[PDB]
Amino acid sequence: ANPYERGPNPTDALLEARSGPFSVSEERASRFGADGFGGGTIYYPRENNTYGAVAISPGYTGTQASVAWLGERIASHGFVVITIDTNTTLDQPDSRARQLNAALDYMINDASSAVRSRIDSSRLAVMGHSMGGGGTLRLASQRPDLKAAIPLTPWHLNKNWSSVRVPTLIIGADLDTIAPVLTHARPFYNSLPTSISKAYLELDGATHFAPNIPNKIIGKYSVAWLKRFVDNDTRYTQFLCPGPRGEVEEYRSTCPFLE
């Protein structure tokens, strides 16, 4: 059996809802305790079990409030999730990568016992919006031990992610004028090795700010991705594969993934 499975067998309805099955509590990571990032909010399942841990970075000029809906929603499906503030709102993608790494360290080592006892420290992921999605790719390139990476409308001037070995779901926004898919999300996806578990989901009719606005599609595929890769949860494969190929412009992947 898979020891990491949580929650009921998924349905489209379970994945599309405002909340997953797990009620969530919050812990502050204050700017005083947070070494190497600007603090954040830890969302954790109340149910006493161990779960994967996820760190989520906002973009340039962004704060944790721009990704909070998504951190809380992901946690509610059985994840310990920290939504971070960066050292400064102007921090660059490679700085956001070090801050994401600091936030994973924070949750594992420095958060309270309620939080540390609910984390399986061997099962980690990172996500991020825009420059925070660039930082997601950078940290994934540096940390093959990460179970999953989800760059959301990512922005990075480095276009070559051929070193990334972490299962990566890139979410692009077709009408993105800030991190245009032609120069960011698509080249990033294309440059990921053909041999890893990866997917590219391009939202239809979506601006750069789609990740900042509660969105059933982003929620559904973010959760499915983390469930598949953080939890090794093959109950979720059928949502990812062959995938949504009306409100998804494009979906490509290396489905079916190796198990």
Side-chain angles (χ1 to χ4, degrees), residues 71-102:
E72 182 179 43
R73 187 174 290 195
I74 292 167
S76 72
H77 284 274
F79 295 100
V80 177
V81 185
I82 187 172
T83 56
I84 70 160
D85 284 318
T86 54
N87 286 337
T88 88
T89 63
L90 304 191
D91 296 339
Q92 290 303 289
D94 297 335
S95 168
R96 293 172 193 265
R98 312 190 286 261
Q99 289 186 65
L100 281 165
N101 185 64

Short mmCIF file of all heavy atoms in Angstrom, two decimals, residues 71-102:
data_model
loop_
_atom_site.label_atom_id
_atom_site.label_comp_id
_atom_site.label_asym_id
_atom_site.label_seq_id
_atom_site.Cartn_x
_atom_site.Cartn_y
_atom_site.Cartn_z
N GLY A 71 -2.21 28.54 -0.82
CA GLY A 71 -1.56 27.85 0.32
C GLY A 71 -2.60 27.20 1.20
O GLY A 71 -2.48 26.01 1.52
N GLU A 72 -3.68 27.93 1.49
CA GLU A 72 -4.73 27.44 2.42
C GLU A 72 -5.47 26.28 1.74
O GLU A 72 -5.77 25.26 2.39
CB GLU A 72 -5.71 28.55 2.75
CG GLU A 72 -6.77 28.10 3.73
CD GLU A 72 -7.73 29.22 4.09
OE1 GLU A 72 -8.14 29.94 3.17
OE2 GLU A 72 -7.95 29.42 5.28
N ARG A 73 -5.76 26.40 0.46
CA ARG A 73 -6.52 25.38 -0.26
C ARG A 73 -5.69 24.11 -0.33
O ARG A 73 -6.21 23.05 -0.04
CB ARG A 73 -6.93 25.83 -1.67
CG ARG A 73 -7.85 24.83 -2.33
CD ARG A 73 -8.35 25.36 -3.64
NE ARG A 73 -9.28 26.48 -3.43
CZ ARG A 73 -10.08 26.93 -4.38
NH1 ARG A 73 -10.14 26.27 -5.51
NH2 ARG A 73 -10.84 28.00 -4.16
N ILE A 74 -4.43 24.24 -0.71
CA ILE A 74 -3.51 23.08 -0.77
C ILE A 74 -3.41 22.41 0.61
O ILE A 74 -3.51 21.13 0.72
CB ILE A 74 -2.16 23.51 -1.33
CG1 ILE A 74 -2.34 23.87 -2.80
CG2 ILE A 74 -1.12 22.38 -1.10
CD1 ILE A 74 -1.16 24.59 -3.38
N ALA A 75 -3.25 23.20 1.66
CA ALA A 75 -3.12 22.59 3.01
C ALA A 75 -4.37 21.77 3.32
O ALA A 75 -4.23 20.71 3.99
CB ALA A 75 -2.85 23.64 4.02
N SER A 76 -5.53 22.27 2.90
CA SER A 76 -6.84 21.66 3.21
C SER A 76 -6.97 20.31 2.51
O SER A 76 -7.91 19.56 2.82
CB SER A 76 -8.02 22.54 2.87
OG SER A 76 -8.25 22.65 1.48
N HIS A 77 -6.06 19.95 1.60
CA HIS A 77 -6.04 18.61 0.98
C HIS A 77 -4.97 17.73 1.65
O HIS A 77 -4.84 16.60 1.21
CB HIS A 77 -5.81 18.73 -0.54
CG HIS A 77 -7.02 19.18 -1.29
ND1 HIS A 77 -7.97 18.31 -1.73
CD2 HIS A 77 -7.45 20.42 -1.60
CE1 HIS A 77 -8.95 19.00 -2.34
NE2 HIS A 77 -8.63 20.32 -2.29
N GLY A 78 -4.32 18.21 2.73
CA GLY A 78 -3.39 17.34 3.46
C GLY A 78 -1.94 17.62 3.15
O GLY A 78 -1.20 16.67 2.76
N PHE A 79 -1.55 18.89 3.36
CA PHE A 79 -0.18 19.38 3.20
C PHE A 79 0.06 20.44 4.26
O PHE A 79 -0.88 21.12 4.68
CB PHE A 79 0.02 19.99 1.81
CG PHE A 79 -0.10 18.96 0.72
CD1 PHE A 79 -1.29 18.87 0.00
CD2 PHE A 79 0.94 18.08 0.43
CE1 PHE A 79 -1.46 17.89 -0.96
CE2 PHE A 79 0.77 17.09 -0.53
CZ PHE A 79 -0.41 17.04 -1.24
N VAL A 80 1.31 20.52 4.70
CA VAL A 80 1.76 21.65 5.53
C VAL A 80 2.35 22.68 4.58
O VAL A 80 3.19 22.33 3.76
CB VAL A 80 2.76 21.21 6.61
CG1 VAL A 80 3.23 22.46 7.35
CG2 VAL A 80 2.11 20.20 7.55
N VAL A 81 1.80 23.90 4.59
CA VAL A 81 2.11 24.86 3.52
C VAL A 81 2.50 26.16 4.17
O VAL A 81 1.73 26.63 5.01
CB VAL A 81 0.94 25.05 2.54
CG1 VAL A 81 1.37 25.96 1.42
CG2 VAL A 81 0.41 23.74 1.98
N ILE A 82 3.62 26.72 3.72
CA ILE A 82 4.00 28.06 4.20
C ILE A 82 3.91 29.00 3.01
O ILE A 82 4.49 28.68 1.92
CB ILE A 82 5.37 28.14 4.90
CG1 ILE A 82 5.54 29.54 5.49
CG2 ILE A 82 6.50 27.77 3.97
CD1 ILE A 82 6.76 29.70 6.38
N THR A 83 3.17 30.08 3.17
CA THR A 83 3.14 31.15 2.16
C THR A 83 4.10 32.21 2.68
O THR A 83 3.84 32.71 3.79
CB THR A 83 1.73 31.71 1.90
OG1 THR A 83 1.12 32.17 3.10
CG2 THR A 83 0.81 30.66 1.30
N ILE A 84 5.10 32.59 1.93
CA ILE A 84 6.16 33.47 2.50
C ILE A 84 5.98 34.90 2.03
O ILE A 84 5.35 35.16 1.00
CB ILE A 84 7.59 32.94 2.21
CG1 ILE A 84 8.00 33.06 0.74
CG2 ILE A 84 7.71 31.56 2.75
CD1 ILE A 84 9.49 33.01 0.54
N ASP A 85 6.44 35.80 2.87
CA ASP A 85 6.95 37.13 2.45
C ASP A 85 8.44 36.99 2.24
O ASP A 85 9.11 36.27 2.98
CB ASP A 85 6.63 38.15 3.52
CG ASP A 85 5.16 38.53 3.47
OD1 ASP A 85 4.64 38.71 2.37
OD2 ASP A 85 4.58 38.58 4.51
N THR A 86 8.94 37.66 1.22
CA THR A 86 10.37 37.70 0.94
C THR A 86 11.02 38.81 1.78
O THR A 86 10.31 39.63 2.39
CB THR A 86 10.58 37.87 -0.56
OG1 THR A 86 9.81 39.03 -0.89
CG2 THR A 86 10.10 36.65 -1.34
N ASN A 87 12.33 38.71 1.92
CA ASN A 87 13.17 39.73 2.63
C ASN A 87 12.73 41.14 2.20
O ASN A 87 12.47 42.02 3.07
CB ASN A 87 14.63 39.41 2.34
CG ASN A 87 15.12 38.20 3.09
OD1 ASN A 87 14.57 37.83 4.11
ND2 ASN A 87 16.15 37.56 2.57
N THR A 88 12.63 41.38 0.90
CA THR A 88 12.05 42.61 0.32
C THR A 88 11.12 42.23 -0.83
O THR A 88 11.35 41.20 -1.44
CB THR A 88 13.12 43.59 -0.17
OG1 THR A 88 13.48 43.31 -1.52
CG2 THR A 88 14.36 43.57 0.70
N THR A 89 10.12 43.06 -1.15
CA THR A 89 9.19 42.80 -2.28
C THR A 89 9.95 42.83 -3.62
O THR A 89 9.40 42.33 -4.59
CB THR A 89 7.98 43.75 -2.26
OG1 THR A 89 8.49 45.06 -2.42
CG2 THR A 89 7.18 43.61 -0.98
N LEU A 90 11.15 43.41 -3.66
CA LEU A 90 11.90 43.57 -4.92
C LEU A 90 12.90 42.42 -5.14
O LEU A 90 13.68 42.51 -6.10
CB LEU A 90 12.60 44.92 -4.88
CG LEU A 90 11.68 46.12 -4.63
CD1 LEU A 90 12.49 47.39 -4.89
CD2 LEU A 90 10.39 46.10 -5.47
N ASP A 91 12.89 41.39 -4.30
CA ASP A 91 13.93 40.32 -4.40
C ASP A 91 13.82 39.61 -5.76
O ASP A 91 12.70 39.47 -6.31
CB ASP A 91 13.82 39.34 -3.23
CG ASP A 91 14.09 39.96 -1.88
OD1 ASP A 91 14.74 41.06 -1.86
OD2 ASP A 91 13.68 39.40 -0.87
N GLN A 92 14.96 39.20 -6.29
CA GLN A 92 15.11 38.60 -7.64
C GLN A 92 14.79 37.11 -7.56
O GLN A 92 14.72 36.59 -6.46
CB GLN A 92 16.51 38.87 -8.17
CG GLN A 92 16.69 40.34 -8.51
CD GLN A 92 15.63 40.74 -9.50
OE1 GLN A 92 15.67 40.33 -10.67
NE2 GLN A 92 14.64 41.49 -9.03
N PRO A 93 14.47 36.46 -8.70
CA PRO A 93 14.10 35.04 -8.67
C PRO A 93 15.14 34.17 -7.93
O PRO A 93 14.72 33.30 -7.13
CB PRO A 93 14.06 34.69 -10.15
CG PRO A 93 13.59 35.96 -10.77
CD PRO A 93 14.38 37.04 -10.05
N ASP A 94 16.44 34.38 -8.12
CA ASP A 94 17.44 33.47 -7.48
C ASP A 94 17.50 33.69 -5.97
O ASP A 94 17.75 32.74 -5.22
CB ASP A 94 18.80 33.46 -8.18
CG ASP A 94 18.69 32.95 -9.60
OD1 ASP A 94 17.74 32.18 -9.88
OD2 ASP A 94 19.52 33.36 -10.43
N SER A 95 17.20 34.90 -5.51
CA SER A 95 17.03 35.22 -4.08
C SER A 95 15.77 34.53 -3.57
O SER A 95 15.79 33.95 -2.45
CB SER A 95 17.00 36.72 -3.89
OG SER A 95 16.58 37.06 -2.60
N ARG A 96 14.68 34.55 -4.36
CA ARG A 96 13.45 33.87 -3.92
C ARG A 96 13.74 32.37 -3.74
O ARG A 96 13.11 31.77 -2.88
CB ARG A 96 12.29 34.20 -4.88
CG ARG A 96 11.89 35.66 -4.80
CD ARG A 96 10.89 36.03 -5.88
NE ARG A 96 10.86 37.44 -5.86
CZ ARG A 96 9.97 38.17 -5.17
NH1 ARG A 96 8.97 37.60 -4.53
NH2 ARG A 96 10.14 39.49 -5.11
N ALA A 97 14.58 31.76 -4.56
CA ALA A 97 14.96 30.32 -4.44
C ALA A 97 15.60 30.06 -3.06
O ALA A 97 15.23 29.10 -2.39
CB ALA A 97 15.90 29.95 -5.53
N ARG A 98 16.53 30.92 -2.64
CA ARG A 98 17.19 30.76 -1.30
C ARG A 98 16.15 30.94 -0.20
O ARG A 98 16.21 30.27 0.80
CB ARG A 98 18.28 31.81 -1.11
CG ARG A 98 19.23 31.92 -2.29
CD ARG A 98 20.42 32.78 -1.96
NE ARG A 98 20.21 34.21 -1.87
CZ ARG A 98 20.47 35.11 -2.82
NH1 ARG A 98 20.80 34.75 -4.06
NH2 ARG A 98 20.25 36.39 -2.55
N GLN A 99 15.15 31.81 -0.42
CA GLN A 99 14.12 32.11 0.61
C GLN A 99 13.15 30.93 0.70
O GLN A 99 12.66 30.59 1.81
CB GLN A 99 13.47 33.42 0.24
CG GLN A 99 14.48 34.55 0.47
CD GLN A 99 13.81 35.89 0.25
OE1 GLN A 99 12.91 36.27 0.97
NE2 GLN A 99 14.27 36.65 -0.73
N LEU A 100 12.84 30.36 -0.44
CA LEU A 100 11.98 29.14 -0.42
C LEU A 100 12.71 28.06 0.38
O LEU A 100 12.03 27.34 1.15
CB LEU A 100 11.68 28.68 -1.84
CG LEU A 100 10.57 29.48 -2.55
CD1 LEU A 100 10.57 29.21 -4.05
CD2 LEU A 100 9.22 29.12 -1.95
N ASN A 101 14.02 27.91 0.15
CA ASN A 101 14.85 26.88 0.83
C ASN A 101 14.84 27.18 2.34
O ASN A 101 14.62 26.27 3.14
CB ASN A 101 16.26 26.87 0.29
CG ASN A 101 17.12 25.77 0.86
OD1 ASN A 101 16.84 24.61 0.65
ND2 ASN A 101 18.12 26.10 1.64
N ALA A 102 15.02 28.44 2.71
CA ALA A 102 14.95 28.88 4.14
C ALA A 102 13.58 28.56 4.72
O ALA A 102 13.49 28.19 5.88
CB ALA A 102 15.29 30.36 4.21
#
